[PDB]
Design a protein around this ligand. Structure first.
Ligand code: CLA
Ligand code: CLA
Ligand code: CLA
Ligand code: CLA
Ligand code: CLA
Ligand code: CLA
Ligand code: CLA
Ligand code: LMG
Ligand code: UIX
Ligand code: DD6
Ligand code: SF4
Ligand code: SF4
Lengths: 131, 186, 119, 86, 79, 663
C-alpha cells in the first residue's frame, strides 16, 4: 500500500467531518464560542428548527398567543386613535401655541402604535411555537 | 409552587389558598417576583404611614411655615411644595423663598438618600432573593424565634399593607370629592 | 499697549520652531542608531524578543500562540479521531492517525521568521 | 527575504526554475504529476522578488507564489550593489 | 492695515484692536505652569505607550494585583 | 545585516498600526494601547480648544468684536515672524501697532452665542480645559495601571480547574464590552450631555442675551422656528428646547441593552442574530468603519445646517465664516466617508471569517455572492451620470459659444422643486398657525434652477464613482479573478508582477488610493457649487448650465483680488493667501512625479548618486553607505507620498481662493 492522493483526500474528509462535530461540543473552548459571540446564551436559545423560539420576545415568552393578540389589537386601536386625534382631528398645535398644554393622553397613546406592531409580531411568534 | 412560595397568597378560611393572581403575573414574571414583593411591601408601608398621617393632621398641626401647615388634607401637598420652578427644582436665584421654592423637598431628598442606601444598595452592589424581599434587618430582634410565628407576622404585615393601600386610595379620593373630616363622607 | 505680549513671542517662536525642532531631529537621528530603534515595527530587535518571552512567561499566555490551543482533553479528541479513521481506513492502509498528524504538522519552511537570529 | 512557496498543482514545467535570475528555485523528484517532478525554493534568501517565476508558470493559478515582505528586506532581496550589509 | 478683497473695501469692514494688553504676564505664567504639567504628564504617557505593558511584573513587582469588584461582575456578566 | 533608507518610510507607514506591532501578542495589549491612544488624543483635543481660547483671550479683540460684531472682524492671533520688514508697516498691522490675523474659524460667534462676555471668562475657560487635559492624561495612566494590576492579579489567580485559561478572553472585557458601552454612550454621553447643555443655555446663554427675566422659567422652552430677526440666528430658547428633547429621547433609548445587570435589557448579539446582520462585532476595524460612517452624515449635516440655519449670533453677517465653515466640514466628512470604506476593506482583509464556499449566512457572504452584480450596476449608473452630465454640459457650452443661449438643453429641476414646494407648504402652514408669525428660515429652501440640476447630477456622479472604487476594493480585497489569493497578502502591497497581463494598483489599498482622487474631485465639485451660489446667486442661476461659465465667471473672474495680493505695486492683507496659493500649487504639482514616475527610474538614479558619494574623496573615507543605505521609495510608499502631495495641494489651494473671493 502507498498513500494515493485519493487516500489523502479521504483522510482530509474524515478529519474534517470528525473535528467539525467535535469543536461544537463542550471540549474546544474557542473565543468565538463565548457568550456574546456566535453561540446562543445558555438558557435563552433564540432560533431553533428554523423558527423564532419563545425566548426571543424576552419577558413576553410566558404570554399566551391570545393575550398577545388582544394586546396587539388594543394597542393598535389606541395608538392609531392617538395619532389621528393629535395630527388631523382635534389638532393640539394651535392650543399649545397660545400658551396651552398638550393633551397628555394623546401623547401617551400615540406611542402605542409601534408597540402594537412589535406586539403583533410577538403574537405570531408565540402562535408558531404553540404557546 | 405558586409565586415562588411567597407569604401572602394563603386564604383565611384555611384549608384553601387564595393565591390571588387573576392576571397570572407571578408565572409571567418569575424573575421579577422579588422586586414585585419589594414593591408590594414598600407600597404597604408607605400607605400605612400615609393613612395615619391623613387622619392625624385633622387634630394636630405642627406650627411652621404658615404657607404650608394650613388647609385640608387635600390642599396639603401642592401647598406644602409651593409654585416650584418646574418640578422639585430649587430656585437658586432666590433661596430663602420670597416667591417660589419647596417645603417638602427635604422629605424628598431624605427619602431619596434612604431609598438609594436602602433598596438600591440591596439590589445593585455585592443580592435580594425571594425570602429576603422586604427584609431590611430593621427590628428583627423583636421578631419571635419560631418558624410559624415569623411567617404569620409577615403575613399580618402584608395584609395590613394591602388594606392600608386600598384605604389610603379611598380616603384621599373621598377627601378630594367632599373634603370633610375623618369619616370622609358627603 | 496692545503689544507687550511679543516679549513672550520673541522667546517662544524661535525656541519652539528652531531650537526644539533641531534638537528633535538630532535626537531622532541619534535614536535611529540604537539597537532598540523602532522595535515595534522593525523585525529582529532585542526588545521584541524580550517582550514575546515575557508574554510567554505569563501563566495565561503560555500556550497562546498555538493555533490548536483550546482542546480541553486532547487525548479524548485524538482517540475519537483514531476511532473514526479506523472505520473509514481504506482497505489495508498502513497510515495511522498519530503519524499522519505528526507529518501534517511538520512542514519545511526554513525561511520563515529567520530574522529571529540576530538580536 | 521574501517567501516563495510551491503548491501541489505544479506539473514540473521547469519554466519557473529557468526564469529565476538568482537560482532560487530547483527541481525535486515527486510523484504527484505525470512529470514525476515538482519545483522547490531552497534558497529564497536570494529571491529578489522579480516574480518572473510567476510569469512563467502555466497552471490555472500559479503553482509557485511569491509573497513580498518589504519590512523584511535583506541585502540580497534588495539587489544592493554599491553597498554591502556584511 | 491695508485691506484686500472687494467686500472689505466696499463695505468698510474694519478690524478693531484693543488698546489694552489682553492678559497680564501673571495670567500667561499661570497658564504656562499647567501647560508644563500637561507636558510632563504627556512625556510620561508617551514613554509608557512606547514601552507597552510588562506582563513579567508578577515575578518582580510587589503586591498581588487587584481586580475591582465591579470588574469581576463585568467579567462574569458576559461580553 | 541592517536596514536601508526605506526603513523610515516603512515604519512611519504603519506607525499607528497597533495590530502590526511586534511586541503585541493578544487583544489585551491591542485594546489597552488603543484606549491609551484615545486618552492621549482627547488630551490633544482639549489642548487645542484651550489654545484657541487662550489666543482669543490674549492676542485678540473679543472684548471689542462683541460690541459691534456686524462690521468688525475678529483676530486669530498675532504675527511674530522675523522675516517681515523691520521697517515701514506690514499690511497686517495698523502702522506701529502689532501684526494680526483675521480669524476665519468661527469661534467668536460660538463663544458669543454660548454666553461669553468678558476676556476673563475665556481665560478661566482656557485654564479649565488645560486642567481637563491633565485629567485625561492621568486617566490614561490610571487605566494602564489598573489593567497591569489585573495582569499582576493573575499571579494570585487560578480556577483550580483546567478552565482557568478561559480568563484569557475576559482580561479586556473593560474595553471590548459592547452592551455597556452602547447603553452608557447613548444615555449619558448623548442624552445627558444634551440635557446638561440645555441647563447651560437656560442658566447662562439665554440670561446673557436679553433683558433680565424670570428665574429661568419653563417659558425659556419655545417652539418658534428659525432665524431670530435681530441676530439672524436660531432662537436660543429653541436651541435649549431642541437639546432638551434630544436628551430626553436619547436618555430613554439608553436603557435598551443589558449593561450592568443580567436581568435588564436585551443583548446586542441577540438583536443582531434575529435580523439581517449578525456581523463579527468583535472586530475593531468593523466598529471603526461603521462609526466613521456615522460621523460622516453628522459632519455633512453640520456643514449643511450651519449655513442653512445659522445657529450662532451674527454668523450669517460674516461673508467668510459661512463659506469657510461649510467647506471645512464638507472636507472633514468626505475624509470620514472614505475612511469608513477603507476600514471596511481592512475589516474584510484582516478581521472577517467566512464559511467554506456556499453557506450564505453572513451578510458579507451574501454581498460577496453577487458582488459582480453590485459592481456592474454601480459602473452602469456611474457611466450614465457621467455621459449625460458631460454631454449636456458640452451641448450648452457649444450652443452658447455659437451665440445661441436659447438652444441649450435646460431640464427644469422638477423633482427637487416638488420636494421644496412640499416642505415650503408645510413650513408656511406651521407659520400661518402662529400668533407670532413672519418668521424666516434663511437658506433651508433655495432657488433651484437647471444649473442646480446639472450640478446635482455631477455630485451624484462623483459620489457614485467614489463608492464604486471603494466598494470594489472592499469586495475584491479578499480575491478577484485577476489575483485569486489577495487575502493572503497585506492590505497594501506593491503589485503582482508584470506577468499575467500586468498588475499595477492591484491591492485594496490601491483601490483606496484611486478613490481618494475621486473623493477630492467630488468635494471640489460640492464646494465649487456652494461657493459659486454664495458669491452671486443670480449669475449662477442664469449662467451656470455651461461649463465655460464655471471656468470664466467663477474661477478666472473671482481670482482677481488674490493674485493682486503681493505684486510690484504693494501688498494687501491677502499676501499670505497668494503666497500659500502658489505654494499649494507647487505642492500639488510636486506629487505628480511620485504618481507618474515610478520606482525603477529613481532607483537607478539613486544608484548613480550613491556611486558619486562613494567616489568623492572625503565622503568615501567616512561613509560607505553600509549603515543607512539610500534607496528609492518603495512602490506603495511612492503612491502614498504622491497622494499626500496631491491631496494637500488640492485641499490647501482652496482656502486662499475662498478668502480672496469672499473677504
Ligand atoms: C512642480 C513639481 C515638480 C518639482 C518641484 C520637481 C522637482 C524635481 N524633479 Mg520632477 N517631475 C515632476 C514634477 C516636479 N518635479 C513631474 C510631474 C514629472 C513627471 C513624471 C517629473 C519627472 C521627473 C524626472 C523624470 C526627473 C525629475 C527630476 C527632478 C529634480 C531635478 C530638479 C532639481 O533638482 O531641482 C531642485 C528641486 C526643486 C524643487 C527646486 C526648488 C527647490 C526649493 C525651491 C529650494 C529649497 C527650499 C528650501 C530648502 C526649503 C527647505 C524645506 C523646508 C522644510 C525647510 C527635482 C527634484 C530629475 C532628477 O531628479 O534629476 C536630478 C529627473 O530625472 N522629475
Ligand atoms: C422599538 C424596538 C424595540 C423592540 C422590538 C423591543 C423588544 C423587546 N425588549 Mg426592548 N427596549 C426598547 C425598544 C425595543 N424593545 C427601547 C427603546 C428601550 C429603552 C427604554 C428598551 C428597553 C428594554 C429593557 C430594559 C428590556 C427590554 C426587553 C425587551 C424584550 C421583552 C419585551 C417586553 O417585555 O417589553 C414590554 C423584547 C425582545 C426586556 C428583555 O427581554 O430583556 C432581556 C428588558 O429587560 N427592552
Ligand atoms: C407617608 C407618610 C406621610 C407623608 C407623605 C406625610 C406628608 C405630610 N404631612 Mg404627615 N404624618 C404622617 C405621615 C406622613 N405625612 C404620620 C404617620 C403622622 C402621625 C405622626 C403625621 C402627622 C402630621 C402632622 C401633625 C402634620 C403633617 C403634615 C404633613 C405635610 C407637611 C410635611 C410635614 O411636616 O409632615 C410632618 C409629619 C410628621 C412629623 C410625621 C412623620 C412620621 C414619618 C412618616 C415616620 C418616619 C418614617 C421613616 C422614613 C421610617 C423610619 C422611622 C420608623 C421607625 C417609624 C405633608 C403633606 C403637616 C400638614 O401641613 O398637614 C396638613 C402637619 O401639621 N403630618
Ligand atoms: C430622589 C428620590 C428617590 C429615588 C432616587 C428613589 C428610588 C427608588 N424608588 Mg422611590 N420614592 C421616593 C423617592 C425616591 N425613590 C419618594 C419620595 C416616595 C414616596 C414616599 C417613593 C416611593 C416609592 C415606591 C412606592 C416605590 C419606589 C421604588 C423605588 C425604586 C425604583 C425606582 C424606579 O424604577 O422608578 C420608576 C420611575 C417612575 C417615574 C415611577 C412611575 C410612576 C408610578 C407608576 C406612579 C428606586 C430604588 C419602587 C421600589 O423600591 O421597587 C421595589 C417602589 O415600589 N419608591
Ligand atoms: C443636568 C443638567 C442641569 C444642571 C446641573 C442644572 C442646574 C441648575 N438648574 Mg437647571 N435645567 C436643566 C438642566 C440642568 N440644570 C434642564 C434641561 C432644564 C429644562 C427642564 C432646566 C430647568 C431649570 C429651571 C426651570 C430652573 C433650573 C434651576 C437650576 C439651578 C438650581 C436647580 C437645582 O437642582 O440645583 C440643585 C442650577 C444652577 C433653577 C434656578 O436656580 O434658576 C436659575 C430654576 O428655576 N433649571
Ligand atoms: C453587443 C453589444 C453590447 C451590448 C448588448 C452591451 C450590453 C450591456 N453593457 Mg456593454 N459594452 C459594449 C458592448 C455591448 N454592451 C462594448 C463594445 C463596450 C466597450 C466600450 C462595453 C462596455 C460596457 C461597460 C463599461 C458597461 C457596460 C454595461 C452593459 C450593460 C448595461 C447597458 C449599458 O451600460 O449599455 C451602455 C453601453 C456602453 C456604454 C458601451 C458602448 C456601447 C457599444 C459601443 C455598442 C457596440 C455594439 C456593437 C457595435 C453592435 C454591432 C452589431 C453588428 C456586428 C451586427 C448591458 C448588459 C454596464 C454594465 O455592466 O451594467 C450592467 C457597464 O458598466 N458595457
Ligand atoms: C478629466 C478627468 C477625468 C475624466 C473625464 C474621467 C472619466 C472617467 N473616470 Mg476617471 N479618473 C481620473 C480623471 C478622469 N476620469 C483621475 C485623475 C483618476 C485618478 C487615478 C481617476 C480614477 C478613476 C477610477 C478609479 C474610476 C474612474 C472612472 C471613470 C469613469 C466614470 C464613469 C463616467 O462618467 O463615464 C463617462 C465617460 C466620460 C465622461 C468620458 C467622456 C466620453 C466621451 C468623451 C463622451 C469615466 C470614464 C470609474 C469608472 O470606470 O466608471 C465606470 C472608476 O472606476 N476614474
Ligand atoms: C491636508 C492633508 C491631507 C492629506 C493626507 C491624506 C493622506 C491620506 C491618509 C492615508 C494614511 C493611511 C495610509 C497609510 O498610512 O499607509 C500608506 C502606506 C502603508 O505602508 C505600506 O503598508 C503595507 C502594509 O499594510 C506594506 O508594509 C507596504 O510595504 C508599506 O509601504 O504608508 C507608507 O507607505 C508611508 C510612506 C510615507 C511616510 C511618510 C512619513 C510621514 C512623515 C510626515 C508626518
Ligand atoms: C429599631 C426599630 O425601630 O425597629 C422597628 C422595626 C419596625 C418593623 C419598623 C417597627 C415597626 C412597625 C411599625 C412602625 C408599624 C406601623 C404600622 C402602621 C402605622 C400601620 C397602619 C395601618 C393602617 C391601616 C391598616 C388603615 C386602615 C384603614 C382603613 C381600612 C380605613 C377604612 C375607611 O373606611 C373608613 C374607616 C372610613 C371611610 O370613610 C373610608 C376608609 C378610609 C376607606 C418598630 C415597631 O418601630 C420597630
Ligand atoms: C388627589 C391629589 C393628589 C393625590 C393623590 C393620590 C395619592 C391619589 C391616590 C389614589 C389612589 C392610591 C387610588 C387607589 C385606588 C385603588 C383601587 C381603585 C383599588 C381597587 C381594588 C379593587 C376593586 C379590589 C377588588 C377585589 O376585592 C374584590 C372586590 C374581591 C377580592 O376577592 C379580590 C379583589 C382584590 C379583586 C396629589 C397629586 C398628590 C396632590 C393633589 O393636589 C391632590
Ligand atoms: S512553472 Fe509552475 S507548474 Fe511549471 S514547474 Fe515551475 S512551479 Fe511547477
Ligand atoms: S521572484 Fe524572481 S528571484 Fe524570486 S524565485 Fe521568482 S523568479 Fe526567482
Amino acid at each position: 500500500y502507498t498513500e494515493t492522493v485519493a487516500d489523502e483526500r479521504l483522510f482530509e474528509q474524515v478529519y474534517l467531518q470528525y473535528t467539525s462535530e467535535y469543536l461544537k461540543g463542550p471540549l474546544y473552548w474557542h473565543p468565538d464560542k463565548l457568550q456574546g459571540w456566535l453561540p446562543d446564551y445558555p438558557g435563552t436559545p433564540m432560533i431553533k428548527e428554523g423558527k423564532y423560539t419563545s425566548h426571543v420576545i424576552g419577558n413576553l415568552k410566558a404570554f399566551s398567543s391570545n393575550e398577545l393578540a388582544f394586546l396587539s389589537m388594543l394597542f393598535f386601536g389606541v395608538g392609531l386613535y392617538g395619532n389621528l386625534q393629535f395630527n388631523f382631528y382635534d389638532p393640539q398645535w394651535a392650543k399649545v401655541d397660545a400658551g396651552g398644554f398638550f393633551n397628555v393622553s394623546y401623547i401617551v397613546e400615540s406611542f402605542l402604535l409601534p408597540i402594537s406592531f412589535f406586539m403583533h409580531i410577538a403574537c405570531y411568534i408565540q402562535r408558531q411555537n404553540g404557546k | 409552587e405558586f409565586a415562588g412560595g411567597l407569604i401572602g397568597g394563603q386564604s383565611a378560611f384555611a384549608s384553601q389558598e387564595y393565591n390571588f393572581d387573576p392576571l397570572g403575573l407571578a408565572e409571567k414574571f418569575p424573575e421579577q417576583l422579588p422586586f414585585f414583593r419589594e414593591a408590594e411591601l414598600k407600597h404597604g408601608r408607605i400607605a400605612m404611614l400615609a393613612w395615619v398621617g391623613l387622619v392625624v393632621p385633622e387634630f394636630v398641626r405642627i406650627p411652621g411655615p404658615e404657607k404650608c401647615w394650613q388647609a385640608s388634607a387635600v390642599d396639603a401637598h401642592s401647598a406644602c411644595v409651593x409654585x416650584x420652578x418646574x418640578x422639585x427644582x430649587x430656585x437658586x436665584x432666590x433661596x430663602x423663598x420670597x416667591x417660589x421654592x419647596g417645603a417638602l423637598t427635604q422629605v424628598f431628598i431624605f427619602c431619596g438618600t434612604l431609598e438609594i442606601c436602602g433598596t438600591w444598595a440591596k439590589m445593585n452592589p455585592m443580592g435580594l432573593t425571594m425570602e429576603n424581599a422586604g427584609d431590611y434587618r430593621l427590628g428583627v430582634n423583636f421578631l419571635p424565634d419560631e418558624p410559624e410565628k415569623v411567617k404569620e407576622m409577615k403575613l399580618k404585615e402584608l395584609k395590613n399593607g394591602r388594606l392600608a393601600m386600598l384605604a389610603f386610595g379611598g380616603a384621599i379620593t373621598q377627601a378630594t370629592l367632599t373634603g370633610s373630616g375623618f369619616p370622609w363622607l358627603y | 499697549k496692545y503689544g507687550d505680549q511679543r516679549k513672550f513671542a520673541a522667546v517662544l517662536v524661535p525656541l519652539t520652531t528652531l531650537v526644539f525642532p533641531a534638537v528633535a531631529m538630532g535626537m531622532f537621528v541619534l535614536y535611529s542608531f540604537q539597537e532598540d530603534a523602532f522595535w515595534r515595527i522593525v523585525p529582529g530587535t532585542k526588545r521584541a524578543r524580550e517582550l514575546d518571552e515575557a508574554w510567554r512567561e505569563h501563566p495565561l499566555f503560555a500556550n497562546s500562540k498555538d493555533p490548536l490551543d483550546g482542546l480541553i482533553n486532547p487525548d479524548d479528541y485524538e482517540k475519537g479521531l483514531e476511532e473514526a479513521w479506523e472505520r473509514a481506513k481504506p482497505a489495508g492502509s498502513t497510515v495511522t492517525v498519530k503519524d499522519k498528524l505528526k507529518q501534517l504538522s511538520k512542514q519545511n519552511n526554513p525561511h520563515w521568521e529567520s530574522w529571529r537570529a540576530m538580536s | 527575504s521574501h517567501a516563495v512557496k510551491i503548491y501541489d498543482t505544479c506539473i514540473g514545467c521547469t519554466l519557473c526554475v529557468r526564469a529565476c535570475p538568482t537560482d532560487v528555485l530547483e527541481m525535486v523528484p515527486a510523484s504527484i504529476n505525470a512529470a514525476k517532478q515538482v519545483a522547490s525554493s531552497p534558497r529564497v534568501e536570494d529571491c529578489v522578488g522579480c516574480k518572473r517565476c510567476e510569469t512563467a508558470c502555466p497552471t490555472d493559478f500559479l503553482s509557485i507564489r511569491v509573497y513580498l515582505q518589504d519590512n523584511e528586506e535583506t541585502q540580497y532581496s534588495l539587489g544592493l550593489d554599491l553597498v554591502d550589509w556584511s | 492695515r491695508v485691506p484686500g478683497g472687494k467686500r472689505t473695501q466696499e463695505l468698510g469692514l474694519v478690524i478693531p484692536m484693543a488698546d489694552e494688553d489682553g492678559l497680564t504676564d501673571g495670567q500667561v505664567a499661570g497658564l504656562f505652569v499647567i501647560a508644563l504639567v500637561v507636558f510632563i504628564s504627556a512625556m510620561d504617557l508617551a514613554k509608557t505607550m512606547y514601552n507597552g505593558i510588562n506582563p513579567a511584573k508578577f515575578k518582580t513587582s510587589k503586591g498581588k494585583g487587584y481586580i475591582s469588584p465591579l470588574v469581576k461582575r463585568y467579567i462574569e456578566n458576559g461580553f | 545585516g541592517r536596514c536601508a533608507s526605506s526603513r523610515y518610510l516603512q515604519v512611519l507607514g504603519s506607525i499607528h498600526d497597533i495590530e502590526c506591532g511586534f511586541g503585541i501578542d493578544n487583544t489585551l495589549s491591542l485594546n489597552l494601547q488603543i484606549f491609551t491612544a484615545h486618552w492621549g488624543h482627547l488630551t490633544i483635543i482639549l489642548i487645542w480648544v484651550s489654545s484657541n481660547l487662550y489666543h482669543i483671550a490674549s492676542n485678540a479683540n473679543y472684548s471689542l468684536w462683541v460690541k459691534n460684531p456686524i462690521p468688525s472682524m475678529p483676530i486669530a492671533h498675532n504675527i511674530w515672524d522675523p522675516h517681515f520688514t523691520n521697517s515701514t508697516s506690514t499690511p497686517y498691522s495698523h502702522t506701529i501697532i502689532t501684526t494680526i490675523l483675521i480669524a476665519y474659524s468661527g469661534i467668536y460667534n460660538q463663544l458669543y452665542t454660548s454666553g461669553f462676555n468678558t476676556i476673563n471668562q475665556i481665560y478661566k475657560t482656557t485654564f479649565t480645559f488645560s486642567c481637563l487635559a491633565v485629567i485625561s492624561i492621568l486617566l490614561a495612566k490610571i487605566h494602564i495601571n489598573t489593567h497591569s494590576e489585573l495582569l499582576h492579579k493573575l499571579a494570585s489567580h487560578t480556577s483550580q480547574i483546567p478552565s482557568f485559561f478561559q480568563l484569557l478572553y475576559f482580561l479586556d472585557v473593560a474595553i471590548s464590552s459592547v452592551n455597556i458601552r452602547f447603553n452608557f454612550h447613548t444615555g449619558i454621553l448623548v442624552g445627558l450631555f444634551s440635557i446638561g447643555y440645555t441647563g447651560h443655555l437656560l442658566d447662562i446663554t439665554i440670561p446673557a442675551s436679553r433683558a433680565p427675566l424670570i428665574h429661568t422659567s419653563p417659558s425659556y422652552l419655545t417652539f418658534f422656528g428659525g432665524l431670530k430677526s435681530n441676530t439672524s440666528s436660531l432662537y436660543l430658547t429653541d436651541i435649549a428646547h431642541h437639546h432638551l428633547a434630544i436628551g430626553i429621547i436619547s436618555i430613554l433609548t439608553g436603557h435598551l441593552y443589558s449593561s450592568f445587570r443580567a436581568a435588564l435589557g436585551t443583548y446586542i448579539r441577540d438583536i443582531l442574530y434575529t435580523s439581517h446582520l449578525t456581523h463579527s462585532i468583535k472586530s475593531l476595524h468593523l466598529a471603526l468603519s461603521l462609526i466613521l460612517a456615522s460621523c460622516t452624515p453628522l459632519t455633512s449635516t453640520t456643514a449643511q445646517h450651519i449655513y442653512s440655519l445659522t445657529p450662532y449670533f451674527y454668523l450669517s453677517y460674516d461673508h467668510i465664516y459661512s463659506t469657510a465653515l461649510y467647506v471645512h466640514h464638507s472636507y472633514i466628512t468626505s475624509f470620514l466617508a472614505i475612511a469608513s470604506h477603507a476600514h471596511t476593506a481592512i475589516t474584510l482583509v484582516r478581521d472577517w471569517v467566512a464559511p467554506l464556499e456556499q453557506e450564505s449566512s453572513s451578510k458579507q457572504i451574501r454581498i460577496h455572492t453577487h458582488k459582480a452584480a453590485i459592481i456592474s450596476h454601480l459602473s452602469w449608473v456611474s457611466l450614465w451620470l457621467g455621459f449625460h452630465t458631460l454631454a449636456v454640459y458640452s451641448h450648452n457650452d457649444t450652443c452658447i459659444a455659437f451665440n445661441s443661449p436659447s438652444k441649450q438643453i435646460l431640464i427644469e429641476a422638477s423633482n427637487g422643486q416638488l420636494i421644496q414646494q412640499a416642505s415650503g407648504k408645510a413650513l408656511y402652514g406651521t407659520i400661518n398657525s402662529i400668533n407670532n408669525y413672519n418668521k424666516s428660515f434663511d437658506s433651508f429652501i433655495h432657488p433651484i434652477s437647471p444649473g442646480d440640476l446639472y450640478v446635482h447630477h455631477a455630485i451624484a456622479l462623483g459620489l457614485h464613482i467614489t463608492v464604486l472604487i471603494l466598494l470594489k476594493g472592499g469586495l475584491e480585497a479578499r480575491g478577484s479573478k485577476l489575483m485569486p489569493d489577495k487575502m493572503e497578502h497585506s492590505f497594501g502591497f506593491s503589485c503582482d508582477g508584470p506577468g499575467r497581463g500586468g498588475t499595477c494598483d492591484i491591492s485594496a489599498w490601491d483601490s483606496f488610493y484611486l478613490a481618494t482622487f475621486w473623493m477630492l474631485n467630488s468635494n471640489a465639485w460640492i464646494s465649487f457649487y456652494f461657493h459659486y451660489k454664495h458669491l452671486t446667486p443670480r449669475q449662477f442661476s442664469e449662467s451656470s448650465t455651461y461649463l465655460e461659465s464655471w471656468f470664466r465667471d467663477y474661477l478666472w473672474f473671482n481670482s482677481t483680488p488674490l493674485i493682486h495680493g503681493y505684486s510690484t505695486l504693494g501688498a494687501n492683507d491677502l499676501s499670505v493667501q497668494s503666497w500659500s496659493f502658489l505654494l499649494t500649487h507647487l505642492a500639488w504639482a510636486s506629487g505628480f512625479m511620485f504618481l507618474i514616475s515610478w520606482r525603477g527610474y529613481w532607483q537607478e538614479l539613486i544608484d548613480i548618486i550613491l556611486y558619486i558619494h562613494l567616489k568623492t574623496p572625503i565622503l568615501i573615507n567616512l561613509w560607505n553607505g553600509d549603515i543607512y543605505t539610500p534607496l528609492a521609495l518603495s512602490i506603495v510608499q511612492a503612491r502614498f507620498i504622491g497622494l499626500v502631495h496631491f491631496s494637500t495641494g488640492l485641499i490647501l489651494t482652496y482656502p486662499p481662493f475662498i478668502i480672496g473671493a469672499t473677504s
